[PDB]
Ligand binder design. Sequence first.
Ligand SMILES: [Cl-]
Ligand SMILES: [Cl-]
Lengths: 219, 215
Amino acid sequence: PHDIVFLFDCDNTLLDNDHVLADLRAHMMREFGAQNSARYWEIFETLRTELYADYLGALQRYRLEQPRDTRLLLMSSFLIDYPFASRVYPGALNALRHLGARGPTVILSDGDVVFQPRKIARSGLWDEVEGRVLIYIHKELMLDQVMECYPARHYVMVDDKLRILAAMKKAWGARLTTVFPRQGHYAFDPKEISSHPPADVTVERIGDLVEMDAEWLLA
Amino acid sequence: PHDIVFLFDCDNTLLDNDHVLADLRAHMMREFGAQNSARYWEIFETLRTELGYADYLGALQRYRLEQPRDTRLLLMSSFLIDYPFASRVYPGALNALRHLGARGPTVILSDGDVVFQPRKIARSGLWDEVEGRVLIYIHKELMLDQVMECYPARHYVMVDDKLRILAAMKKAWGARLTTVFPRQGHYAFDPKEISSHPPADVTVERIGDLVEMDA
Ligand SMILES: [Cl-]
Ligand SMILES: [Cl-]
């Protein structure tokens, strides 16, 4: 096994995904039209409702609605070619290096089969964790499989969604330390903030993790 | 309404897609091992079989369900995303398209998913060759009403390597349509397709031979 495994969410934890979405939305409107791009987002927001970012299903439903508009499907070319390495948070690579010396670092992410893997790979994060990457539709429903890939006496989960940390905490209990970094917009959403138990630790920045070796309780 | 509209498939009509699949498979046998890839391809085959066209994307989703912790085979996508599609465009295809474009709208009518096929058509340079006149559907032969609304013509030409498609479209449009079959790719060489289906109005050895089409 392992004394400790450090599990990381990717979006708004390791890398600034809000900024990616802001850049996408601005691009889409410029290339495809205000009306057309507004509509795709209305679909992408029901889907973000039901699942995490479902770029893909939103695309598939947009096509049914407007099968003549092939062009808007090229929005993928923005994501595919986006500079994700520029969006990695200051200190994020240092935290992964620092904690990697004490136990395996693993990226545990919700996502589709095209964009999310490509993001993690092209951001350079994939290789920073030596390919220790699991990507699910709902990671908190696959916690059994996470354990057998990366068995450990204790786990840490760093994630900006309190809902996820709360679900994982309920599943694993004292075997888990939950860390909520106050990054992105789920950090300041009042529903999230008010409807789930608090994380064990809150850090202002992902780079604050280098200051807490004592909390891992390692020999 | 135009006198004539020229409709073209992409895969194995304007672009050599077998060469691409061949390179893709060698990349996957070489990077994600033999069985992982074998499995992916058994799945791909099945949905190519019932969808009617090559769906990499759906094949990849089905694979994830089956092999959820093999996260890295999913990075097969990146080979396709960065492939040099322009090098695969057949000799004389850009000529056929520009000459015929002098006589009426040139249009790409392809089956596709929503990620890989459009990217391919764009990065190949063919999207700009037909000036954006690109339609990509799940079952293009079931969408012929829309195609007529978008490109009203008195006569259509359809270039496609699938005698199944040409036949379905001729059964719909009859004398309004000239079907063209280019002997390109593996369907050119298929006892199964050649004998299951009727012949096209025209057969040509190569796509570039359609510069000779001035009626
Ligand atoms: Cl732009
Ligand atoms: Cl005309």
